[PDB]
Design a protein around this ligand. Structure first.
Ligand SMILES: *P(=O)(O)OCC(C)(C)[C@@H](O)C(=O)NCCC(=O)NCCS
Lengths: 79, 410
């Protein structure tokens, strides 16, 4: 799977977690924090994407991204 | 061999701030902190410190003991990330003001919020060693959040003050330990740290992911050692290190999804039954660092059902990091003893700070910063707060004189 395919999956669970963003355009430079997604739900999105991709590695390996585009890059690098 | 907690006592501070007031003061909707299951945080006054918190937590334990039983306390472990000296343990002051024996090992233990659990495990092993049959240990987890007016801004809403004292012995009237039922897991990570005094630094997002990793792996280690254990069926209640309740709800959900393949409604019902009772007191004090899991245990006992004996699973995490999953049993008799401590009443009687008082408190806190050589406290900083403390047999910090801390019963 590629960077762009993963970004779509991140957008899906983001909208699933924050229904108010269902009809909102999300850019790669958008940050979950600035979108209003709280601390627990930012972790939840990561774990949902990990599970969707069957990526069974430590959760901390997906830390440190400053926007969803960078999160996509992190996932892409792991497989 | 029987071992565990003979007595448990809590000090949840003299004053608290309602987080709705903080939200209002920073233009946030109320729903942000209610969403995260946060209600109030305890706040240390300038005339309190981790020693005074510790002594206030332990005093009810010592007051109940016979002279003979008080003299049997031969180890005092203070568990803290709020230390007052690079070498002097807070245990020395604690021993002095509680009137304990001079034939007593005394030291302080550090590993962020894992400190309390580490101390409890060392105390358990003293009893199990049978090196000194009849000896007891006193383990006190004590921490304050003395923010000065930042690296710490991420933690303001969540960072409380509190202490929990445990008497550990071969007659565990409150919590009977499942001996050798332990899993533990740790590794070096820069999730949060305290590289300067009176402060905290880190990436809370990384810290949450690390907590979740440890929750899984520490429990797996326990499961490997305790054949046939089931995360739903073996534990009547679950108590967790609780930085804030919302993330414990998330951790429990993650564990239930992976271990039991449970559906969302089932998980939420299980959360309310097994996890919410432990959150009740945590919501009233905030994160009290190494003491928080012990407060959660006390909350589980008071707020859950012990009409028959119950097994409680315990998860400890400390940033940096290390973690442990362990367990024990509480009987109806133990729960009845615990109820006599009146924790809920104690917490309800604290002074409720205005946002104006809270801001003044932060400003005034610099006078007792780490490294202070001389200070003489004004007890009448807030006359109304004092009226709540005076006459209750509380220890306070009176002064520091050439680095020597002086305390007073008021
Ligand atoms: P999030 O942006 O919803 O923030 C959560 C919160 C406002 C409680 C915040 O103050 C915070 O992150 N505090 C907790 C810091 C901490 O101790 N994290 C530990 C995670 S194991």
């Amino acid at each position: 799977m590629s960077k762009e395919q993963v970004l779509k999956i991140i957008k899906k669970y983001t909208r699933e977690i924050a229904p108010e963003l269902e009809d909102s355009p999300l850019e790669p430079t958008d940050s979950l924090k600035k979108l209003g997604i709280d601390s627990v739900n930012r972790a939840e999105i990561i774990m949902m994407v990990m599970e969707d991709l069957s990526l069974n590695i430590p959760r901390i390996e997906l830390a440190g991204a400053k926007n969803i585009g960078e999160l996509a890059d992190l996932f892409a690098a792991k497989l | 061999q029987q071992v565990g907690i003979e007595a448990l006592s809590v000090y949840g501070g003299a004053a608290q701030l309602e987080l709705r007031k903080l939200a209002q003061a920073r233009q946030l909707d109320i729903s942000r902190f209610d969403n995260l299951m946060m209600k109030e945080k305890a706040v240390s006054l300038p005339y309190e410190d981790p020693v005074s918190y510790a002594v206030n937590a332990a005093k009810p334990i010592i007051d109940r003991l016979s002279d003979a039983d008080k003299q049997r306390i031969e180890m005092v472990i203070t568990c803290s990330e709020s230390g007052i000296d690079f070498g002097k343990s807070m245990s020395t002051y604690i021993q002095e003001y509680l009137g304990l024996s001079r034939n007593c090992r005394m030291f302080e233990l550090k590993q962020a919020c894992y400190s309390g659990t580490a101390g409890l495990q060392m105390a358990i092993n003293l009893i199990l060693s049978q090196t000194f049959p009849g000896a007891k240990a006193l383990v006190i987890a004590t921490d304050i959040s003395r923010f000065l007016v930042y690296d710490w801004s991420f933690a303001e809403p969540s960072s409380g003050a509190g202490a929990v004292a445990l008497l550990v012995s071969d007659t565990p009237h409150i919590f009977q330990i499942d001996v050798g039922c332990n899993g533990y897991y740790g590794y070096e990570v820069m999730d949060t740290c305290r590289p300067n005094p009176d402060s905290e630094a880190g990436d809370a997002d990384l810290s949450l992911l690390s907590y979740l990793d440890c929750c899984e792996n520490a429990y797996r280690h326990y499961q490997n050692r305790v054949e046939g254990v089931d995360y739903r069926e073996s534990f009547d209640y679950l108590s967790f290190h609780t930085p804030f309740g919302g993330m414990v709800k998330g951790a429990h959900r993650n564990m239930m999804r992976r271990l039991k393949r449970a559906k969302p409604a089932e998980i939420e019902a299980d959360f309310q039954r097994r996890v919410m009772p432990g959150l009740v007191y945590c919501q009233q004090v905030g994160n009290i660092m190494g003491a928080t899991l012990f407060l959660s245990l006390a909350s589980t006992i008071d707020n859950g059902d012990f009409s028959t004996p119950r097994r409680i699973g315990m998860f400890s995490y400390g940033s940096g990091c290390c973690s442990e999953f362990y367990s024990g049993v509480v009987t109806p008799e133990g729960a009845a003893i615990a109820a006599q401590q009146g924790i809920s009443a104690q917490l309800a009687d604290r002074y409720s700070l205005s946002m104006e008082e809270y801001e003044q408190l932060l400003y005034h806190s610099s006078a007792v910063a780490f490294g202070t050589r001389n200070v003489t406290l004004d007890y009448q900083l807030f006359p109304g707060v004092w009226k709540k403390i005076a006459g209750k047999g509380r220890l306070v910090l009176k002064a520091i004189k050439e680095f020597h801390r002086k305390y007073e019963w008021v």
